[PDB]
Design an enzyme around this catalytic site. Structure first.
Site, short mmCIF file in Angstrom:
data_model
loop_
_atom_site.label_atom_id
_atom_site.label_comp_id
_atom_site.label_asym_id
_atom_site.label_seq_id
_atom_site.Cartn_x
_atom_site.Cartn_y
_atom_site.Cartn_z
N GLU A 1 80.42 84.04 -30.75
CA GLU A 1 80.84 83.67 -32.10
C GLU A 1 79.76 82.92 -32.87
O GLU A 1 79.91 82.72 -34.08
CB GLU A 1 82.11 82.82 -32.03
CG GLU A 1 83.28 83.52 -31.34
CD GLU A 1 83.24 83.38 -29.83
OE1 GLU A 1 82.43 82.59 -29.32
OE2 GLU A 1 84.03 84.08 -29.15
N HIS B 1 81.27 76.35 -22.93
CA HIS B 1 81.44 76.91 -21.60
C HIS B 1 80.93 78.35 -21.56
O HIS B 1 80.80 79.03 -22.58
CB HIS B 1 82.90 76.87 -21.18
CG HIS B 1 83.36 75.54 -20.69
ND1 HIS B 1 83.10 75.07 -19.42
CD2 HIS B 1 84.08 74.56 -21.31
CE1 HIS B 1 83.62 73.87 -19.28
NE2 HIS B 1 84.22 73.54 -20.40
#
Lengths: 367, 370
Positions: B301, B248
């Site tokens: 990340e 997302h």
């Protein structure tokens, strides 16, 4: 807006554990009144399961060796250090990776460990050890706690802690219970949420904790007159321990439970404590006739605990032991809720600026 | 006393007003006290100064030097070890409750624990049987980031120190997550700073907290061996396993921290960069194809794993690097909450069983009365 920081009045959760009916003047654990629980002599071990499981039947696991032989003079900090070691040594897994059955066991196993740390820390270092068979053959956790500490405890003192621990097992959604719910909503292991709840409890503004009324109770026994010393403390600028604004509609139900247990068991300082309560109430209501003033449960909690040979500085650790029931209840409820707890914030700080615009930028070393 | 379109989890409920930082999600930019993070990284502002920028609101101060550990306890879990050390700070280092100290003492005590957690992570990655890095060669360093890589690697590559500075500054603070919220609640009670810092680390360890660097190292290893970058991701999605590092949209368009870290990888010449971008082009183009309606963007990340691996950080040491960086956000929010000086105490609504007797409860048969 007209908003209040800290989510004062904002409803955060939906609970089935207990209801602190302040309007009605009663506290019910899963519908069962606490006045009924102390009167029929239900031990803290059963009330722990009534809050956690929603019914009776299960108890608490036996005592086991400490996961870390820690001892630093601060028992609150010692339990937190031991709670950390539960994941590497005892293999505690995250809440997301275990079922409700495993999470219930680890909560009870951690609850027993926190009580084992507190009981052992109270018994002197050079005292003769209590044999393990005497410990393991105790009827209740309250008896096991007292025997591990005192060796051969007074039965009247065991009943006093049973009265106090179930009257403090759970009292709604305060800062410590909120912290355990937020950490558990992340999916971390139960020891992390329990360690966070203990950290929130160590704050002076958290809430309930046995009052420092002993130096005043001692003074009344020596002087004889309670009205004079109560008037003196308020005139010399100091505040009065154990008395303030109301909490419930009127008298706290937990306040009468701990006073009736003090009279029922025959506490030596009961008569002075009542004499202090009358002088304090009559004096506080006389100076602020507009304020609603009721006796704090923390006043009679100190009377009952001190009756059971509990020193002043150990009393806050006594409250932590009883509150494990409420903490483990809300941790399991949060696990079944399965919703992350994240609020938001609104930014009021400075707008966009360059690094050279910031104060003190001439002292920065770059490259 | 009744629910009213009530959602659990305080989602969207405003709890505090902050001057620390602003994650402009609609604008696609992140600012620390007004300063863009792209400026802070491109002009090579070290992490120690960004720490002082977030906590103090200006530049000037730094961080105290390192010191021995308060507790020689090491269980193999650096997260647990740091929490155990944070505990000892009250009796061994004399940390007082926030209610009994001023802003100056609390600021240090936060900075002293911040350096304590960094040294825990630092020389936990160095073999004890390797030669003890000299004590003075550490003192001859300048930045807090430089002393970290010196205690660990001995002779750190100057490019790697810039990469850590790029990462820690990007992840120093990102708004109102669970760990930051937990730190504020504990601090709102008046406890010491070490307890509030320990509570955030516990909430940080939960899998649903997010932000931890992605486990994309095996995928990047497989792409380099069999060079296609597209058939490698195409097969993973066909078999039905999760595509790491993508999902997302966090920001509305592109996470500014992801842009910063990807540029930092190319600027410093990370060997995995060329392979990394091809995996990014293939995964994004693939995920958008299989879902032409869902907004899908690269996770920060994912690049955080590329940058940290270039700095010779193992796969399961990367979470500790995240905790090290976030000490700036945790301390700044702790200090601001101290000055706010108001307890956090929400409410709940009871919907459970009505008043009943102890005998009408399932299991009263197995109760022994005192």
């Amino acid at each position: 807006e007209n908003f209040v920081p800290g989510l004062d009045g904002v409803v955060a959760f939906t609970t089935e554990i207990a209801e602190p009916d302040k309007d009605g003047g009663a506290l019910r654990y899963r519908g069962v009144d606490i006045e009924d629980l102390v009167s029929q002599r239900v031990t803290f071990g059963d009330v722990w399961a009534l809050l956690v499981d929603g019914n009776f039947g299960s108890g608490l696991p036996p005592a086991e060796p400490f996961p870390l032989p820690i001892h630093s003079g601060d028992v609150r900090v010692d339990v937190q250090a031991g709670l950390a070691m539960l994941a590497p040594i005892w293999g505690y897994a995250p809440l997301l990776d275990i079922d409700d059955a495993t999470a219930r066991q680890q909560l009870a196993r951690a609850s027993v460990m926190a009580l084992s740390y507190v009981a052992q820390s109270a018994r002197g270092i050079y005292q003769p050890a209590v044999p393990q068979r005497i410990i393991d053959e105790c009827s209740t956790v309250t008896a096991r706690f007292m025997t591990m500490w005192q060796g051969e405890p007074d039965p009247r003192h065991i009943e006093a802690i049973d009265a106090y621990w179930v009257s403090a097992a759970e009292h709604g959604m305060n800062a410590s219970t909120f912290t355990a719910r937020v950490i558990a909503s992340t999916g971390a292991d139960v020891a992390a949420a329990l360690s966070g709840a203990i950290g929130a409890m160590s704050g002076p503004l958290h809430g309930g904790a046995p009052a420092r009324v002993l130096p005043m109770l001692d003074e009344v026994e020596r002087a004889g007159d309670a009205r004079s010393v109560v008037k003196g403390i308020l005139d010399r600028g100091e505040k009065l321990m154990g008395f303030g604004h109301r909490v419930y509609r009127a008298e706290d139900p937990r306040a009468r439970v701990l006073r009736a247990a003090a009279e029922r068991l025959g506490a030596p300082r009961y008569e002075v404590a009542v004499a202090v309560e009358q002088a304090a109430l009559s004096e506080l209501r006389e100076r602020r006739p507009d304020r609603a003033i009721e006796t704090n449960v923390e006043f009679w909690a100190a009377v009952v605990l001190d009756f059971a040979r509990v020193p002043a500085n150990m009393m806050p650790a006594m409250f932590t032991c009883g509150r494990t029931a409420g903490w483990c209840a809300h941790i399991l409820e949060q696990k079944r809720l399965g919703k992350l707890v994240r609020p938001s914030a609104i930014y009021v700080g400075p707008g966009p600026r360059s690094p050279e615009s910031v104060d003190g930028w001439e002292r920065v070393l770059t490259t």
